[PDB]
């Protein structure tokens, strides 16, 4: 039997999938700790590794496999179901088993995706500081027609202090926050003027290293929901540019409260997919 994570219906992904739009022919690159390619509920078509000693098709952490399942866990009679189960998944390892990677390794992963015709890039990662080479890579990937989604950060808030990390803080990147099954903001979701949209990030169940499934919390779980929504929209309107898809997502989001806390609200793919 296949479990359907509460995040799929909450963002109305099940409604557009039912119309027969599931991300087919859309290339998605998950810049993470790799992906357990052998996982029976995932189909990795390719990728690259910029982490010394580790192949792209192995995940010693569990993070990238989890994020990848949220985006494209196969629609079958087992495991879970992804937001866009027909998307072409590319694992780009830019982080190691400990969940860390250099700036060089990240911008390299960004360039590889842009150069190899990736339609969407998900970066469930962030830092307190950015780089000029990082900003350059992301801006050029966006201006070239790639949708760039990044986790906003798990530094909750302070008292009127922007806690959005990099690259989420960049103009060309969609900063994603986290809500729970009740659609309420999760207390760990970063806050700031760059917050753009929200998605399921608390108690998210997805694929996990060595043919199993686990539950994780974090804006690193929310991000793949928007990356998958972007893939769903593209599989329906392949004529859209990055900014139009981006626009669809934020203009049709369900308002939830102050934008400094919820951005434009929780995404709605049925409305976004037109
Ligand atoms: C996720 C993470 C992510 C990030 C961090 C910082 C900044 C940005 C992004 O979540 N993990 C896990 C669970
Ligand atoms: Ca499945």
UniProtKB/Swiss-Prot annotation:
<keyword id="KW-0964">Secreted</keyword>
<keyword id="KW-0106">Calcium</keyword>
<feature type="binding site">
    <location>
        <position position="170"/>
    </location>
    <ligand>
        <name>Ca(2+) 2</name>
    </ligand>
</feature>
<keyword id="KW-0732">Signal</keyword>
<feature type="binding site">
    <location>
        <position position="80"/>
    </location>
    <ligand>
        <name>Ca(2+) 1</name>
    </ligand>
</feature>
<feature type="binding site">
    <location>
        <position position="2"/>
    </location>
    <ligand>
        <name>Ca(2+) 1</name>
    </ligand>
</feature>
<feature type="active site" description="Charge relay system">
    <location>
        <position position="220"/>
    </location>
</feature>
<comment type="similarity">
    <text>Belongs to the peptidase S8 family.</text>
</comment>
<feature type="active site" description="Charge relay system">
    <location>
        <position position="63"/>
    </location>
</feature>
<protein>
    <recommendedName>
        <fullName>Subtilisin Carlsberg</fullName>
        <ecNumber>3.4.21.62</ecNumber>
    </recommendedName>
</protein>
<comment type="function">
    <text>Subtilisin is an extracellular alkaline serine protease, it catalyzes the hydrolysis of proteins and peptide amides. Shows high specificity for aromatic and hydrophobic amino acids in the P1 substrate position. May play an important role in the degradation of feather keratin.</text>
</comment>
<feature type="binding site">
    <location>
        <position position="76"/>
    </location>
    <ligand>
        <name>Ca(2+) 1</name>
    </ligand>
</feature>
<dbReference type="GO" id="GO:0005615">
    <property type="term" value="C:extracellular space"/>
</dbReference>
<keyword id="KW-0378">Hydrolase</keyword>
<feature type="domain" description="Peptidase S8">
    <location>
        <begin position="5"/>
        <end position="273"/>
    </location>
</feature>
<feature type="binding site">
    <location>
        <position position="78"/>
    </location>
    <ligand>
        <name>Ca(2+) 1</name>
    </ligand>
</feature>
<keyword id="KW-0865">Zymogen</keyword>
<dbReference type="GO" id="GO:0046872">
    <property type="term" value="F:metal ion binding"/>
</dbReference>
<keyword id="KW-0479">Metal-binding</keyword>
<feature type="active site" description="Charge relay system">
    <location>
        <position position="32"/>
    </location>
</feature>
<feature type="binding site">
    <location>
        <position position="168"/>
    </location>
    <ligand>
        <name>Ca(2+) 2</name>
    </ligand>
</feature>
<feature type="binding site">
    <location>
        <position position="74"/>
    </location>
    <ligand>
        <name>Ca(2+) 1</name>
    </ligand>
</feature>
<feature type="binding site">
    <location>
        <position position="173"/>
    </location>
    <ligand>
        <name>Ca(2+) 2</name>
    </ligand>
</feature>
<dbReference type="GO" id="GO:0004252">
    <property type="term" value="F:serine-type endopeptidase activity"/>
</dbReference>
<dbReference type="GO" id="GO:0006508">
    <property type="term" value="P:proteolysis"/>
</dbReference>
<feature type="binding site">
    <location>
        <position position="41"/>
    </location>
    <ligand>
        <name>Ca(2+) 1</name>
    </ligand>
</feature>
<keyword id="KW-0720">Serine protease</keyword>
<keyword id="KW-0645">Protease</keyword>
